[PDB]
Write a protein that binds this ligand. Structure first.
Ligand SMILES: Nc1ncnc2c1ncn2[C@@H]1O[C@H](CSCC[C@H](N)C(=O)O)[C@@H](O)[C@H]1O
Ligand SMILES: [Zn+2]
Ligand SMILES: [Zn+2]
Lengths: 114, 296
């Protein structure tokens, strides 16, 4: 047994639940690289930058991160969210994947498949 | 006009007065600044504080050490810590702390009363946003407050590196006479009001470049009265203008020299370097922190 918070959150959103709030949006130039997870805010014109810990489902729910080491890849970093998705940064980071080659979100900036 | 600045610092002539303490009655009491869409008050407030700190002679060594007290919020997150982490050079060691649990971007977080926090090492910058809303009691005399202010005064004197700086949040009722006196132990000091929160009696008491001894004698009861007098007679127009230009925000990594010195070797030439933001005096060992836990 283990609690599936990731699945529980996705299921709650499909039910019409209000997304997790108070993710920390930063002031920035919006002229950054647009990479997904960075040491400093890197939003481009199509993105918002957020403090990473505040958009991590596991940090925010006070539950273990699901990898044997319990490391968090968001805490202490900044996450770039497409502005059209910025009402639910937790859900967005949960549901999406970063390209290991260029560092953009798959389907939101990664063009490695062209 | 001051509306394009990140905030307003207490003018020198107000510091030199000898006022009696009055009630703070702010003209712009009911105004609120227009924040950029979706930006939290405290992200805006810390951004303007850091923008102002960019204009001072802060020492910025490699492997800078910063501690942030009062970093939690009723939202369970740490907006100010996220701004500090943005502002500070990459690799800066940032520790934060609060009475109540919260989720943080800091390298390490301690939960508990600040009086329980101990650190082996000295720090290059101390930020405090600690505040107890209970202090706002307009029906009793507005006296110097102890509580966490006592802790902060001792922490500065024992754990701030020479050459280091502080920014400590105060308000009309949340203040301490010894903290003002301690500002005379820095090369320079001010009380800074952010433009986004200028309708509040809040300020940050900023001490720039710690010298470890009084360079000027400050009576803290008088200087708080001077601060209130300034606020009472100088309405500050609410403004978020400086939040829209973020191009020069990051703190410049100056690579400030760090040396260990005995007290005997702090000569006038060393004092001069400290006063210019050109030297930090502390050890460079490992950073070790702890929180005391009371067992039943
Ligand atoms: N004695 C004490 N020790 C530690 N924290 C204290 C304290 N007294 C008050 N505080 C904390 O000071 C905080 C003030 S609100 C701070 C907001 C925060 N800086 C932000 O970025 O949004 C509260 O969270 C409160 O818990
Ligand atoms: Zn996390
Ligand atoms: Zn890619």
């Amino acid at each position: 047994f283990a609690v599936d918070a990731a699945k529980a959150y996705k299921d709650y959103l499909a039910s019409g639940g209000q997304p997790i709030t108070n993710c920390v949006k930063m002031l920035c130039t919006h002229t950054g690289t647009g990479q997904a997870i960075t040491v400093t805010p890197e939003a481009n014109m199509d993105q918002e930058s957020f403090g990473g810990a505040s958009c991590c489902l596991y940090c925010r729910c006070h539950i273990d991160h699901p990898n044997p080491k319990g490391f968090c890849d968001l805490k202490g970093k900044y996450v770039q969210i497409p502005t059209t998705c910025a009402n639910d940064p937790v859900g967005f980071t949960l549901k999406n994947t970063v390209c290991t080659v260029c560092g953009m979100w798959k389907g939101y900036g990664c063009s490695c498949d062209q | 006009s001051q509306a394009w600045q990140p905030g307003v610092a207490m003018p020198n002539l107000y510091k030199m007065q000898r006022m009696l303490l009055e009630k703070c009655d702010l003209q712009n009491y009911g105004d609120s600044a227009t924040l950029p869409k979706g930006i939290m008050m405290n992200v805006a407030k810390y951004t303007q504080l850091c923008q102002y700190l960019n204009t001072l002679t802060l020492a910025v060594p490699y492997n800078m050490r910063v501690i942030h007290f009062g970093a939690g919020s009723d939202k369970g997150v740490a907006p100010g810590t996220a701004v500090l982490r943005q502002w500070l050079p990459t690799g800066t060691l940032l520790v934060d702390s609060d009475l109540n649990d919260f989720v943080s971007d800091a390298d390490s977080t301690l939960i508990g009363d600040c009086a329980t926090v101990h650190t082996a090492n000295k720090w290059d910058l101390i930020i405090s946003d600690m505040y107890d809303p209970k202090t706002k009691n307009v029906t009793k005399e507005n006296d110097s407050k102890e509580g966490f202010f006592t802790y902060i005064c001792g922490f500065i004197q024992q754990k701030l590196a020479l050459g280091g700086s502080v920014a400590i949040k105060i308000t009309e009722h949340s203040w301490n006479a010894d903290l003002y006196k301690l500002m005379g132990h820095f090369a320079w000091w001010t009380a800074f009001v952010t433009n986004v929160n200028a309708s509040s009696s809040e300020a940050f008491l900023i001490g720039c470049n710690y010298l470890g001894k009084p360079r000027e004698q400050i009576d803290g009861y008088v200087m708080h009265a001077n601060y209130i007098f300034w606020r009472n007679t100088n309405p500050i127009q609410l403004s978020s203008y400086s939040l829209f230009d973020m191009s020069k925000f990051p703190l410049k990594l100056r690579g400030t020299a760090v040396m260990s010195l005995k007290e005997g070797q702090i000569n006038d030439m060393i004092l001069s370097l400290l006063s210019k933001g050109r030297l930090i005096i502390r050890e460079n060992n490992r950073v070790v922190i702890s929180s005391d836990v009371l067992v039943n």
